[PDB]
Design a binder for this molecule. Structure first.
Ligand SMILES: Nc1ncnc2c1ncn2[C@@H]1O[C@H](COP(=O)(O)OP(=O)(O)OP(=O)(O)O)[C@@H](O)[C@H]1O
Ligand SMILES: Nc1ncnc2c1ncn2[C@@H]1O[C@H](COP(=O)(O)OP(=O)(O)OP(=O)(O)O)[C@@H](O)[C@H]1O
Ligand SMILES: Nc1ncnc2c1ncn2[C@@H]1O[C@H](COP(=O)(O)OP(=O)(O)OP(=O)(O)O)[C@@H](O)[C@H]1O
Ligand SMILES: O=c1[nH]cnc2c1ncn2[C@@H]1O[C@H](COP(=O)(O)O)[C@@H](O)[C@H]1O
Ligand SMILES: O=c1[nH]cnc2c1ncn2[C@@H]1O[C@H](COP(=O)(O)O)[C@@H](O)[C@H]1O
Ligand SMILES: O=c1[nH]cnc2c1ncn2[C@@H]1O[C@H](COP(=O)(O)O)[C@@H](O)[C@H]1O
Lengths: 461, 460, 460
């Protein structure tokens, strides 16, 4: 339960910008003595959930984040065949070794240059008949005819190791390698994946989020139109480890009905529903059958929902109120929206959320589905965009009529960090910060963070 | 500390949030104010230079101590470098400054680069330890940059025996083309320089000195490793004050470190930090600190706050911690976020006994970094943080732990084209604080904290 | 030279006015061309570095001579520095290069600055003459700039004994993370470094060497004072070639100086300049010069032309003077305005035996000036003129003569973010000139001038 400094009782509600954490007496010396695992049934080992947005939640993101202990929620209305293919891909991945970009010897240098940035490894693996035969780097593509063949620029010499080799050993094998990529082989010699020095280190820091079969975790979202029960059962059968019942205004009869319909199917999976920003909405969603309530409605005062409707709530106050209500009912809260810095993750957790959902921030990474773009200053970025009517309740004349008022798709430019270009660099950034918040507070884990935290309010100074 | 009636905000206060209400005053002159501190640091003005490699070099330590401040050498400075730095500072004259020196065989290019390590506007050419000429920036212009210093140096300059009264040196320089007097030892060797402004400052600032009359200096130590052994070595090297420094001072490892150092009975004032709470202040004092350094993420948009959400608005932090320390007979240093003389005055009004300044003083001639110039040819220097040297701590194992460590962030600190030296900043700071006391009716720093009335203002 | 029929313009020609027409060629490969010169300079490529303090330092002299050029030390360099420079250059290895070296106790800040004095991308850390590590620019990033080199140096690096076949060293570096081989003397002390590109260049460029197999170097003298005594001392210090240099070469004081030096019978090639006319070329050769340096105000907008109206378009100047020198068995150096490989090729087509290059080579790592960065953070260095060191020459009287002296003009020469080393410029120049020869059908430089057909183009 949060405590505020004496007298810090503002006549207004609080954003992540309004509050600070006061250090407390601590005997948690090292960041690594903190346990970042969550307690809400999601199965995450770090408190990061990737938002059910097409701009962010693709198969590369789902593999990469779950390996480091987060979970990705697939966007609602992804066709069920594509759900199954995505789940099968993620759940066939190695828990340590990553999936590289692969090239044919007959690919063009131009196509190789474009594909390289789909992963953060800095190299693609040339394969012939399933066997790795070389590496292609960005440097190998410079100053050559963009329609030359990959065969003519690929490097035949690279570090290789059998899949299952200790990450400690792979790390040392790469110490004096020119290219910081080890090509991992299956017993027959075919490609099993890659491991970089930083990937080797991360294996010893992050615990993979895994299902009961030991395969990487993945979640899936459903909107509240149509046959919500049938959609949810299909997602469960496709292999989702967690269902998110998602709508813009969660505190409404159609959402309550949808939760009861999914809960009555007894699918055996944690059920998230949202979004609300009130204790009353939180209670009603839990009593309908959800165990996790997703919290966040127009948290940004200048963002589209607030400027169209006036409707929203400052997110820190929303999470504090909803998490306390959920805690009294045996449930949990996900803080959804507005996260742009590790501070926001730490404050949402201090406020009592069990997990933090991140959307547009993660669009600005190699692993998000969108294409890598470059602005006027040649700086890298990717476009985030909203789910719009896929989060809303719903003749050719009649089609245009209902379509006239629906929300447009807003687009934002999310710059890639030249130093944190991969999502795993953001995860290092986020969890380094949260681990530090825990040491300042005196907390050895996330329950203790929320139990011990002291907060204050600051002015616009 | 007294606020205007009703000024009880539902939030904590930064330096930007508050103002001092003038009071009835009989303190007419700025110079009637006593700026000396009462915390055992020995400073005669309330300025301490932060233990940061970007700021706390030997030129800074000499220059600030002569004007009554003290410089804290950065933690993990190797002990031989500590001894060499202390021996340099403690061999400096109390009035006469150390100039840039040049060999006749140095190049004009090197002379030009070295001139800006001090604020004197002239380097002294020396031969066999004795002054033979002056080099100015104007002497370097329009000359082949690989010409020798001997071919641009001025052989005519004001000289006087070291020990000459600063008033008389001031007058000797009144009609000199170059505002630099070259001071000599009895054997003719260079003893230092004195400018007309340096001579005036000798009459305004009392040097901060040890019991032997030598310039004061302090040294910091982090809480990893053998803190007692490190502190004992710093004491034997001659530090006048020890600073036990860590990002999160309110933790067991810091309490243990204070007790270990205190048990060695080194005979020096012990500073420990950083905290921002009354409880943290009490705990550091009870472990053995006499002075508590206060400041944790005071800037809402700076790295610590944006990484962790952790911190506290610095005026409120200093108010609460100073009051806690004073009940126990201790003191607090206000550490962080100082950018204007107002911040120094407000820290003291809040009850701090001393104010620690870091990045602001990086933008001076005397800081250790190189003088740089931006797109508009304006001078600046980079300040950067101490990072993991303030944090608690196989090649795989090393890279594992190194992954999460705080990176070194850098900021550009512009030099004032009129306050380019740190002593100009000290003039600016102490002129302002003296005026704050005259407005409050205070004749010294205890009276400033006792008599001040403060108010809160809006974002207007 | 032959010009296309009717190409007889009513004006003189710059390097921008002319083009070379391809001829029937059986010179297939650029590597079949012999770029060695025939003027007694001993260069194996037609490049001479100008006698300018902005360019002609010891690192440049070593680096260019190893690739077959020669550097002319600036006039009025003190004879003790001449001797030190000559001794440095003539003790260099003909294949292995001199690296930047560092002490383990140097700062990261100093290491970063020194790295750019060579093009190797790495400095060698030395303790007691022995190499113990390599420092790269990447090693310096993200660490405290006052950390010690010891804490960032890489202890793993490729090493081979001096005398190892360059082709073997090239192979040894194929999978090395750092493209630098540390070459050792028999006792294991540092002898130098070799990179993969340095290994390749050893198979392309023949070092310019004296009869004892040591790298060649030249030295310049102005025409004031005791020219014969100065020339004698330069020869005694070991210069392989002397340059008698003045702004207006066609004058009595220059003729006297050439005769004075010629009469000493020093046994060295003797360059004198500068002139732009057939009459001046004949007079300098008759006075005793073997090589005439050609070039006076070749740029219509540069300082000499804008101050006096005096000069001559350089391509016409070279054509006229080279033809005149050939009638007397002499040679011509094309001095001034070279900015592209085209200019070198056109100078040689015009009949020059060698091409002297100044400010272009200031924008390299190996030039003596410091590496600078412009408003866009792009690397550059400043070239500047020798000014009154090329001119004929009470403190009142000194100021009277000084009032009219030429000021030093300064210009920014940007480094190529790739071709930052002077050897990269030599690759650019000699690749171009070799191509010119293949287009002309010439197997060597005399054939280039004998076979070339030129044309004139308009301003379009
Ligand atoms: N059939 C589909 N209908 C609608 N959206 C889809 C469909 N298939 C995939 N998507 C969406 O396209 C985006 C990219 O999905 P995914 O990463 O699975 O594609 P991919 O082509 O396999 O990826 P990659 O770019 O790595 O080749 C996601 O937003 C996903 O939800
Ligand atoms: N051996 C060392 N290891 C690490 N840091 C050092 C060492 N010696 C000095 N420093 C740091 O380098 C910076 C400059 O130190 P200092 O001014 O004493 O050096 P200096 O070279 O003698 O000075 P100057 O700038 O006048 O030439 C300071 O941050 C200091 O702490
Ligand atoms: N004593 C001197 N007087 C005048 N000019 C000099 C003197 N010594 C060197 N120079 C000039 O200084 C410049 C640099 O010379 P040189 O390269 O020999 O110096 P260095 O200090 O050994 O170089 P570096 O350390 O940068 O490699 C050249 O223009 C050279 O002519
Ligand atoms: O089109 C949209 N409009 C408004 N909110 C949206 C839209 N699409 C997604 N959202 C919400 O915004 C969250 C992501 O917020 P972000 O992390 O600040 O980008 C999602 O998890 C949804 O709750
Ligand atoms: O790397 C760092 N991160 C955060 N705080 C730092 C760092 N280095 C120094 N500090 C603190 O910042 C103070 C200086 O603050 P400044 O005067 O605002 O620059 C120091 O005295 C330390 O308390
Ligand atoms: O100060 C100067 N003014 C004019 N010409 C100069 C000066 N210094 C050197 N020079 C000449 O300019 C040549 C170099 O020309 P650059 O290669 O175009 O820079 C030298 O070799 C000299 O002939």
């Amino acid at each position: 339960m949060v405590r505020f400094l004496d007298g810090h009782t503002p006549a207004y509600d609080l954003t992540y910008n309004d509050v600070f954490v006061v250090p407390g007496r601590s005997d948690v010396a090292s960041r690594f003595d903190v346990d970042l695992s969550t307690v809400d049934g999601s199965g995450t080992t770090i408190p990061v959930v990737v938002a059910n947005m097409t701009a962010v939640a693709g198969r590369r993101m789902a593999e990469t984040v779950a390996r480091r202990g987060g979970i990705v929620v697939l966007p609602q209305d992804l066709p069920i065949t594509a759900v199954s293919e995505t789940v099968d891909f993620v759940k066939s991945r190695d828990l340590v070794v990553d999936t590289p970009v692969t090239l044919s010897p007959e690919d063009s240098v131009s196509d190789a240059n474009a594909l390289l940035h789909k992963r953060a490894h800095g190299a693609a693996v040339v394969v012939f008949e399933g066997r790795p035969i070389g590496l292609v780097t960005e440097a190998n593509c410079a100053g050559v005819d963009r329609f030359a063949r990959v065969r003519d620029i690929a490097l035949s010499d690279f570090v290789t190791a059998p899949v299952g080799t200790d990450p400690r050993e792979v790390f040392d094998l790469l110490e004096h390698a020119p290219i910081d990529v080890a090509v991992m082989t299956a017993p027959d010699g075919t490609l099993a994946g890659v491991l970089t020095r930083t990937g080797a280190i991360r294996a010893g820091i992050y615990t993979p989020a895994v299902d009961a079969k030991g395969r990487l975790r993945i979640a899936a979202a459903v909107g509240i139109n149509g046959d919500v029960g049938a959609k949810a059962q299909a997602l469960a059968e496709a292999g989702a480890d967690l269902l998110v019942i998602d709508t813009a205004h969660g505190h409404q009869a159609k959402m309550l009905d949808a939760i009861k319909a999914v809960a009555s199917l007894d699918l055996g999976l944690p059920l998230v529903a949202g979004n609300v920003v009130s204790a009353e909405g939180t209670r009603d969603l839990i009593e309908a059958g959800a165990s996790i309530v997703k919290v966040g409605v127009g948290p940004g005062a200048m963002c589209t929902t607030r400027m169209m409707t006036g409707v929203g709530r400052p997110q820190f106050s929303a999470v504090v109120e909803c998490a306390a209500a959920a805690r009294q009912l045996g449930g949990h809260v996900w803080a959804d929206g507005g996260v742009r810095h590790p501070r926001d993750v730490a404050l949402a957790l201090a406020a009592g959320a069990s997990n933090v959902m991140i959307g547009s921030w993660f669009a600005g990474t190699y692993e998000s589905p969108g294409d890598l773009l470059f602005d006027r200053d040649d700086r890298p970025y990717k476009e985030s965009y909203g789910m719009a009517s896929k989060r809303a309740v719903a003749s050719s004349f009649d089609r245009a009529r209902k379509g006239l008022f629906e929300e447009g798709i807003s687009t934002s430019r999310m710059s890639l960090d030249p130093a944190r270009g991969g999502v795993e660099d953001l995860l290092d950034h986020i969890t380094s910060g949260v681990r530090s918040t825990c040491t300042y507070v005196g907390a050895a884990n996330l329950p203790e963070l929320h139990e011990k935290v002291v907060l204050g309010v600051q002015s616009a100074a």
